Amino acid sequence: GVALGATRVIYPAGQKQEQLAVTNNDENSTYLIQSWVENADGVKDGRFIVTPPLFAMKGKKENTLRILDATNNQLPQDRESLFWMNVKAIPSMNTLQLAIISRIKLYYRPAKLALPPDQAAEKLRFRRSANSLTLINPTPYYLTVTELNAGTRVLENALVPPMGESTVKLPSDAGSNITYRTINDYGALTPKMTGVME
Amino acid sequence: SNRARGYIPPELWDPGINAGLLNYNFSGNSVQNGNSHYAYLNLQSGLNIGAWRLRDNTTWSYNSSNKWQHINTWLERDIIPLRSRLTLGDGYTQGDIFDGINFRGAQLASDDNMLPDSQRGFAPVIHGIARGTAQVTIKQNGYDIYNSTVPPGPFTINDIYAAGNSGDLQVTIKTQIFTVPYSSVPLLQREGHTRYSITAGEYRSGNAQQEKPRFFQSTLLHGLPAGWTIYGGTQLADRYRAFNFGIGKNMGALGALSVDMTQANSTLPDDSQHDGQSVRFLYNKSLNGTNIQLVGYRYSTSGYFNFADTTYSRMNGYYNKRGKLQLTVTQQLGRTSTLYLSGSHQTYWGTSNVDEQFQAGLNTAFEDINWTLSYSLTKNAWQKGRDQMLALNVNIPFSHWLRSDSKSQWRHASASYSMSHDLNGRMTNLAGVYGTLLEDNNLSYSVQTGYAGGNSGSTGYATLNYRGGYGNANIGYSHSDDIKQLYYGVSGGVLAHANGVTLGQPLNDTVVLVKAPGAKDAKVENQTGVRTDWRGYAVLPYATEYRENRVALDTNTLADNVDLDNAVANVVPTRGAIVRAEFKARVGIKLLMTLTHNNKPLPFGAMVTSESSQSSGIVADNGQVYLSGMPLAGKVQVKWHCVANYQLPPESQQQLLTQLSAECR
Amino acid sequence: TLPGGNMQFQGVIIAETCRIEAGDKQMTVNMGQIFHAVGEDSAPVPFVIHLRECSTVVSERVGVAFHGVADGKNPDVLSVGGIATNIGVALFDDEGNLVPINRPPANWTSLHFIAKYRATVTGGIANAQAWFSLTYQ
């Protein structure tokens, strides 16, 4: 099998290139690894080049993917931008061929940000509508809200865009108390925070 | 015939390369008060021809207020079939059951590192009958230590990870649930596990008066079923004949008790034979708040002398021990603090001399602060001095106050404080700040001003350790009341191999010589300040022996013209093996051509190999082939034949990735 | 016995993506050779996909989806490309519910799927490729 080095890749602004580890643990296997970067909307974008785009991995061999930068400093410097790093592993074999695409997040993080990453998750606020819940995110970071419980019931994870809001379904009988967890840069759930309404 | 977890077959171990070696460690001390200059140069030679490992040590001293002294020489080797080694020449004994002595002769000892990481230490084997196919799950402290599926019939699991004291392994088959508690003593062995240290030669000691007699110190620790561990030995020599025998046991919940009786017929330099005995107990108990009680008792009978005492000079030269009780308690108060209560006691034959050595300690990890309170009562009846020392160490990292994303260099700094009260009026405190400075975290400043309380002279220090890509250096200054020392040391390592001489950081046994021709100044991953030379070779200071290491080149630091084929390589080295991990550094323009043929993009998967410059690349999609190391001209061969020409303007060299479009024939 | 000094250990631990391993090696699902009405299905063929070497935190929030070349006759069935015509490959979940292809990722440590031939008729060699995309939230 093939497994990526990290679940999310933080790209600092101005850095020439970033690396992502592609591992293979099966000795008797040949995998053609194809890679590309999509924009936030799932459309292929040529602003980030992943080299080598296509290469073959024989045996227990792991390579490093060099994510080159081609934006020419056009993304906003006051908020993060989200990109989707895609890695497809074609097995170099009436049969059905299965190719796995391990899509991960790729945050383009500008150098100068007011809020530190750790002190940004707790700044998320809440607003309870009649049958929907709105999450205000004044921090310039993308926030991944998981394990979102509104009372005794569990809601669906929402990815709140920076300086924006998202909406999730909210049952009418759910308790007023709201608690949430956020996934940090390392892919580990932060300690439980209480949800202060607005 | 199931293999153990993490098993590297003995067919993948690399003996190394026929390469030389030279490790030098200079040191200087320009004390000022009349100023005396010191210099202690240290040379460690080597020559790894074939599978043998010749070594050598040499020191040169100097004093301003010139003598080459030889120290050691040995030809170590690894005998893979017997899972052992051969330390022909100088060396020292393990001294596990006996007492360690330095010798000059052959030694054939079993090596534990050659076994996988799983079959190390003590961990009981799990037997039993599992009717039909099931899934055994070893439950311990509510954790799945070992989760596997078992075929019908009896099953043996011997790869349980050594978890120290811990608790009980509740085996959960699927459903006869039987528990297997276990404890450990350092001298216990797994089932079927054997060790031996057959030795010979002379007895070499630093003292001048001691003689150099022949001796034969053989040992053996054969594990048995049910946890018993029969271990014996024989330190037979010319005038000293010992026969150590012992038997350990894993009693499960009750703990583990190791007993060994040692009879030694010694002939002291007065030509007076002295028969004796010696009985040693090691008791280990755990999880009684988790009081880890360790008791060690060693009784002796008058006339029992170790080999170090029967090797003295004759009568014209110029109080054997009776019992040594050691008690150790480690209680964890909470999830941060751990209280230590060590203990020691001793008697002597014919005298009431009692050498008590009681040591307490309270170590805490309050948030970032790691404050340690310590207590010591070093008591010797010969001096009748309590020597009570109450020390308080503190450690306040600067990250506790600074931001997390701050670019300031202070983020690596970490303050400190070492209060040291002697309970006699003498007080000593050193309040200093240390941490790394340079961008690559090489340089380490440690300015630590200090004061002493009755003299009242302040004690200043400022060490500057630099762990560079060629050799460590440090210019450490030290100021006191009337002493103004100024250290200056230079380390390094030279590795003269087949392709040339390459300098590097001080070698630590196993080394890895990375060969990357054409790539200059590329940092290797997970190593502080290790960079390739101008030729492209670098020397890794250390690599784990008999394991699978990982050597990688940080692609960020590579030049704008160098692209690597495989940026990660793994090496499995034998002990003392200069293993070569080689990378191909393709130098040239990285161009991403949109290859087309008959106004249709080439099929996905088509191979494109250049002609003028060696390069290759598969066509990703729509004809975007990523060719590295290509010159400003040349042709490409498309095979899926077709040949395409491209012409790069001279401006292409500046651009990191020069995209072009070439129509194939 | 003399006091030493403070020693600080530094390092960072990062998570990793679950490595994908099918029970049938080389990620190949054999279907064998090749319907009174259009839409009838053939003998079921099972294959398993194991998400191993990852913690249960990541493996629970992985969004699974399917992509593939939609058949010309049936947009919701994988096309088979001497080649059998008017047929395709359909994917059914463990519960027996059809899994539409080219759909937004949905939240599903081991995943069982069944591949069945669906008629959209001539026999022949039928080869299809499926993209199994895992979004790591």
Numbering used by the authors:
A (entry chain C): 1 to 93, 101 to 205
B (entry chain D): 121 to 153, 157 to 188, 196 to 304, 310 to 423, 426 to 455, 478 to 613, 617 to 802, 809 to 833
C (entry chain I): 7 to 40, 45 to 91, 95 to 121, 129 to 140, 144 to 160
What does the paper say about this structure?
The pilus consists of a flexible tip fibrillum, formed by the adhesin FimH and the subunits FimG and FimF. The assembly platform FimD in the outer membrane of uropathogenic E. coli is the catalyst of type 1 pilus assembly.
To explore the structural implications of FimI-mediated termination of pilus assembly, we performed a FimD-catalyzed assembly reaction of pilus rods in vitro similar to the one for the FimDHGFAnC complex, except that excess FimICHis was also added at the end of the reaction. Using Ni-NTA affinity chromatography, we separate complexes with a terminal FimICHis subunit from complexes with terminal FimAnC and determine the structure of the FimI-terminated assembly platform at 3.6 Å resolution (map XIII). To identify structural parameters explaining assembly termination by FimI, we next analyzed the interfaces between FimC and FimA (model IV), FimC and FimI (model XIII), and FimC and FimF (PDB-ID 6E1422) in the respective FimD complexes. While the interactions between FimC and the respective subunit (FimA, FimI, FimF) are primarily mediated through backbone hydrogen bonding involving the G1 strand of FimC, differences emerge in the interactions with FimA strand A’. In general, the total interface area between FimI and FimC (1739 Å2) is larger than that of FimA and FimC (1562 Å2) or FimF and FimC (1449 Å2) and involves more potential hydrogen bonds (FimI-FimC: 30 H-bonds, FimA-FimC: 21 H-bonds, FimF-FimC: 19 H-bonds). Indeed, we also identified a closed P5 pocket in the FimD-bound FimIC complex. However, when comparing the usher complexes with FimA or FimI as the last incorporated subunit with the usher-tip fibrillum complex (last subunit: FimF, with open P5 pocket), we found that the P5 pocket was closed in the terminal FimA subunit as well as in FimI. In any case, a much stronger binding of FimC to the terminal FimI subunit compared to a terminal FimA due to a larger interface and a higher number of inter-molecular hydrogen bonds appears to be critical for assembly termination by FimI.
